[PDB]
Amino acid sequence: ISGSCKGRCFELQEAGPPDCRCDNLCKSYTSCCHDFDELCLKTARGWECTKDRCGEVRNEENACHCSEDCLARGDCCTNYQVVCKGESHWVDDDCEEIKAAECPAGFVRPPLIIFSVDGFRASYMKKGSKVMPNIEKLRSCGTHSPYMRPVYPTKTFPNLYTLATGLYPESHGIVGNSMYDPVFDATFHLRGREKFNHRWWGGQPLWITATKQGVKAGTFFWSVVIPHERRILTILQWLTLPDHERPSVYAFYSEQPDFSGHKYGPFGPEMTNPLREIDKIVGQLMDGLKQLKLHRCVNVIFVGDHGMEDVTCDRTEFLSNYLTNVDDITLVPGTLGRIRSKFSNNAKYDPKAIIAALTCKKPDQHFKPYLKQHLPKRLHYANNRRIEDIHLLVERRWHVARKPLDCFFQGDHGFDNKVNSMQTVFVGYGPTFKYKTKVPPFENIELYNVMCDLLGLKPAPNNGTHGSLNHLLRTNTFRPTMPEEVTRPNYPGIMYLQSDFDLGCTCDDERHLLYGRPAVLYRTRYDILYHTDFESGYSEIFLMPLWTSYTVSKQAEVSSVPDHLTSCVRPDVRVSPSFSQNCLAYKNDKQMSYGFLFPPYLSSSPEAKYDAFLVTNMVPMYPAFKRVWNYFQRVLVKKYASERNGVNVISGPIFDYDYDGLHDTEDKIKQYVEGSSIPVPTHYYSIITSCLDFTQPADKCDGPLSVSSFILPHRPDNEESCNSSEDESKWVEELMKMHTARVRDIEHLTSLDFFRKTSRSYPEILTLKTYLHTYE
Ligand SMILES: Cc1c(Sc2cccc(C(=O)O)c2F)c2ccc(Cl)c(F)c2n1CC(=O)N1CC2(CC2)c2ccccc21
Ligand SMILES: *[C@@H]1O[C@H](CO)[C@@H](O[C@@H]2O[C@H](CO)[C@@H](O)[C@H](O)[C@H]2NC(C)=O)[C@H](O)[C@H]1NC(C)=O
Ligand SMILES: CCCCCCCCCCCCCC(=O)OC[C@@H](O)COP(=O)(O)O
Ligand SMILES: [Ca+2]
Ligand SMILES: [Cl-]
Ligand code: NA
Ligand code: NA
Ligand SMILES: [Zn+2]
Ligand SMILES: [Zn+2]
């Protein structure tokens, strides 16, 4: 009946005016029928059958029931069979492998329940069975990782919506817990109504993907005011619905342990209770499912949004100690900083000046300013109009605020997503996940694809790498295919004499490709060039290599370049003068110098060293960046070879002038070496590969591979590195670590595909390419 929730509690629709609502989200729109509390939120006698209620006469006021008709009526407390029928709690039962789903007739697929926990730090799982026994049984009997990496910013809204969509925040649009959109001229806040406007929420979240493909997602979101125990009872009742109504996916959200973590810090002794209380809810779910005989039917994901760090009031940096004018800016503060102009019509606003005022001003200053395009590419945090041009990455354990006038809290989060304290949890338990299986850490951007696979859905386009988590599942409906090469290489031979060239250059005169050539995944023209010490894929369009590959053995020697050869550049008789760089361009560019992708310092002989001076191995480099690049090539590469028992290196340029994380078409390139068609890269990458079993040398490795990579910003100064006035051994490797990257990041930024001929399974190589070497 319209106007009442009788017979309608938690109906799977949102009734519109003139009717009122009886669904799980009605409270959040202040729209519930007058009798919703009375009928749908019963609380009498709490959530647990006790021995004195067994054989009770049913009382309709009770939150849940313990009577002999309750299973037929669909309303037992989750512990009814345990207390009254001699059954065991789920947690007390032995792990038993689930070799196939055991679902009731009419279940077309295993249901999926996503149990999300706010601020659940990875290391809380160490507390184990004494504190969280149900969760520990899911973890030990199911599939788990040591941690899961959140997205940046490591806050709730960006992370939950990444879980929902498979997208980086810059793509889904929820780039913070608070944001300003200049086109809407509106502000999104944690507290308030503006966030409920769907206009903010981009991409295609799981519930929509499901509905579009005819999979029932029901009423996906709960009003958070509804107690957890009622949500669990409701999910279980929904799972008893007829085939034509019953949803196939459910979500639960707990605001704990985040709520307490803010008050008490990540390891306050007060944190124990909230973790026990979460475990009690997990136990109710699992007992409830066993009661319905669905405990070997439903896939359960237990997942956090981010971790929690020790952060106090007194550890706050104030912009007023740096800026000569704090009144003309608006700051989004806290564990990150975003700065824009306070007023719209402010011609005086100068982001570059503000950045300079914030750069390396105090020793051990606890934040670093960036223009968004200069942030580490691994953060993927730039390509959205809601991201302010000025960003502050704040040091773990610190806050930033505008003025002192701006302790009540002991924990916070939001920091760089490679910070260990920000890591969170993943457990997958059920028929589709593996049994008692540990998997390596992975990123939360990958989970949307997994949830799609679990539900038989085709994922919308997203930033996960589909196939990269196939090792979490007992059975895989998705078989990834290697992308086809788009441009086939040319293989030029000797076509010229040195005297055919007038480049203004002067000179006073497969082992190196271990995992197959990269594939070029865009339309272009390029040459494979072979040399004694290195191989390259030379672009005739960009006039430089797209990639340069070389193997350095553990015993390789580093040599210097003789004085008489420091400016040696040689024409390449395989490549037309028309598709070559020239040395006059560099001489005429007061700001630009050059470096080499294969370093002369690692030549195998003084005769082979002449290959390293080829014009086809040169790339444009600011002198400030050459400090970085020379140290990497002359010092670090050999160090890594010694540590890793040889390394294979692939290095190259990246062009991303519009900071979308994608390889630029030529029209986007904004800078060239003066008076030339030689484009200036925005970054230089390297992918460094060796044998995971370091007792085998990198070029004779029988097993899995070990990889680490970076994307270095190609900057005309070293203002980013506050200790750059010192020797490179004090600061270069620190810069490299900050700019660590996944191979997949480089693939997007270059339209290349790597690791195509390793003789390992492709899903394993996908995992390898999504690996991030964090340095913690
Ligand atoms: C508005 C919203 C919230 S905050 C929120 C949600 C529920 C209850 C409460 C509460 O105070 O009781 C609350 F504060 C939220 C949180 C996590 C995720 Cl992951 C979302 F996505 C959220 N959203 C969008 C949200 O619900 N869409 C976006 C969209 C794509 C357009 C869509 C379509 C259909 C149904 C829903 C949705
Ligand atoms: C992250 O994935 C999304 C979705 O595939 C990519 O965003 C799309 O980019 C294309 C190509 O420019 C646009 O035409 C689409 O409109 C975009 N979709 C969305 C939802 O934004 C994005 O490029 C990916 N990011 C990276 C770094 O690979
Ligand atoms: C497919 C996976 C979907 C993901 C789960 C869907 C359920 C999510 C419901 C979340 C409601 C959020 C309510 C809220 O507003 O709390 C935020 C606080 O914490 C404060 O933020 P923070 O932890 O400091 O970042
Ligand atoms: Ca680009
Ligand atoms: Cl934010
Ligand atoms: Na120059
Ligand atoms: Na510096
Ligand atoms: Zn959170
Ligand atoms: Zn929080």
72 CB neighbour count, 10 Å cutoff = 9
- What are the two backbone dihedrals, phi and then psi, of residue 766, each rounded to the nearest 5 degrees? -60, -45
Catalytic residue (one of 143, 154, 156, 689):
156
743 contacts 685 by C-beta, under 8 angstroms: no
Residue among 174, 258, 453 whose CB has most ligand 3 atoms within 8 A, to mutate: 258
Instruction: Please give, one letter per residue, the 3-state secondary structure of 616-649.
Output: HHEEEECHHHHHHHHHHHHHHHHHHHHHHCCEEE
SS3 readout for 566-628: CCCCECCCCCCHHHCCCHHHHHHCCCCEEEECCCHHHCCCCCCHHHHCEHHHEEEECHHHHHH
Strands of the 426-429 sheet, one edge to the other:
249-257, 112-118, 299-304, 426-429, 143-144, 437-438
The count of other CB atoms within 10 Å of the CB of residue 628 is: 26
How far is C-alpha 673 from the chain's CA centre? 35
Same domain, 512 and 391: no
Q: Which residues are CB-neighbours of 667 under 8 A, at least 6 positions away?
A: none
Final residue of a structural domain among 87, 120, 153: 87
Q: Is 378 in the pocket of ligand 2 (CB under 6 A)?
A: no
Peptide bond into 577 cis (omega under 30): no
Q: What is the CATH number of the domain that holds 709?
A: 3.40.570.10
| Residue nearest ligand 3's atom 14 by CA | 190
Cα 472 to ligand 2 centroid, rounded to whole Å = 26
Question: 118 a known binding residue?
Answer: yes
**748 contact partners, CB below 8 Å, separation of at least 6:** 661, 662, 663
Establish how many alpha carbons lie within 13 A of residue 305's alpha carbon, considering only the half-sphere containing its beta carbon: 25
CA distance 682 to 656: 6
616 marked as part of a ligand binding site: no
d(CA 46, CA 35): 20
Residues 502 and 406 in one domain: no
Residues, beta carbon < 5 Å, ion ligand 6: 586, 589, 592
As beta bridge partners, residue 187 has 180
Tell me the C-alpha distance between 702 and 696, whole Å: 8
**Are 513 and 662 part of one and the same domain?**
yes
d(CA 762, CA 384): 33
Residue 204 · residue 165 · CB < 8 Å = yes
Domain termination site, one of 450, 478, 506: 478
| Bridge partners for 618 per DSSP | 596
Residues with C-beta less than 6 Å from any ligand 1 atom:
28, 160-161, 164, 195-196, 198, 201, 205, 208, 221, 223-224
- Side chain identity at 586, as an amino acid letter? Y
Are the beta carbons of 33 and 4 closer than 8 angstroms?
Answer: yes
Tell me, in angstroms, the distance from the centre of ligand 5 to residue 190's CA. Answer: 9
Does residue 140 share a domain with residue 34?
no
Query: Do 36 and 46 have their domain in common?
Result: no
CATH number of the domain enclosing 82: 4.10.410.20
Confirm if 22 and 33 have CB atoms less than 8 A apart. Answer: yes
Which listed ligand is nearest to 717 at the C-alpha? 7
Q: Give the single-character DSSP code of 38.
A: H
Instruction: Tell me the C-alpha to C-alpha distance, in Å, between residue 333 and each of 353, 710, 770.
Output: 20, 29, 31
Active-site residue flag, 156: yes
Q: Is 461 in the pocket of ligand 2 (CB under 6 A)?
A: yes
Query: By the 8 A CB rule, do 118 and 156 touch?
Result: yes
Question: Does residue 163 sit in the same domain as residue 15?
Answer: no
Ligand 4 centroid to 745 CA: how many Å?
Answer: 12
Q: How many domains does the chain have?
A: 4
Asked whether residue 295 is marked as a ligand-binding residue, the answer is no
Give the ligand whose atoms come closest to the C-alpha of residue 260.
Answer: 9
CATH of the domain at 369: 3.40.720.10
Contact 391, 181 (CB under 8 A): no
662 CA from centroid of ligand 4 (Å): 4
Q: Is 497 exposed, middle or buried (0-12, 13-18, 19+ CB in 10 A)?
A: exposed
Relative to beta strand 544-552, strand 593-596 is unpaired
Residues with CB under 5 A from ligand 8 (ion): 118, 156, 258, 305
Same domain, yes or no, for 235 and 341?
yes
* Ligand 7: centre distance to CA 184 (Å): 39
Omega of the bond prior to 599 within 30 degrees of 0, cis? no
Q: Are residues 564 and 491 in the same domain?
A: yes
Ligand (nearest to CA of 120):
8
Question: Are 483 and 468 members of one domain?
Answer: no
Q: Which of 24, 151, 156 to mutate to test the pocket of ligand 3 (most atoms within 8 A of CB)?
A: 156
Alpha-carbon distances of 221 from 81, 198, 235, 447, 760, rounded to whole Å: 29, 14, 12, 19, 42
Count CB neighbours of 105 within 10 A: 5
Q: Domain check: are 223 and 286 in the same one?
A: yes
Quick one: 277 exposed, middle or buried, by C-beta within 10 A (0-12, 13-18, 19+)?
Answer: middle
- Give the separation between CA 40 and CA 134, rounded to whole angstroms: 28
Taking the C-alpha atoms of residue 687 and residue 741, their distance in angstroms, rounded to an integer, is 9
Give the mutation target among 113, 159, 163, 190 for probing the ligand 3 site: most ligand atoms within 8 A of CB. Answer: 190
Atom number in ligand 2 closest to CA 171:
21
Report the separation in Å between the CA atom of 368 and the middle of ligand 7, taken as the mean of its atom positions.
Answer: 12
Virtual torsion, Cα 72, 74, 77, 79, nearest 10 deg: 60
Rg of the chain on CA atoms, in Å: 30
Pocket of ligand 3 (CB under 6 A): 114, 116, 118-119, 155-156, 160, 163-164, 177, 190, 206, 224, 251, 253, 255, 258, 451
Domain end position, chosen among 426, 455, 478: 478
Range of the domain at 60: 42-87
Query: 713 with 731, same domain?
Result: yes
228 & 210 share domain = yes
Q: How far is the CA of 191 from the centre of ligand 8 (A)?
A: 14
Query: For residues 697 and 118, what is the distance between their CA atoms, to the nearest angstrom?
Result: 44
How far apart are the C-alpha atoms of 111 and 250, rounded to whole Å? 8
User: 223, exposed or middle or buried, with CB in 10 Å at 0-12, 13-18, 19+?
Assistant: middle
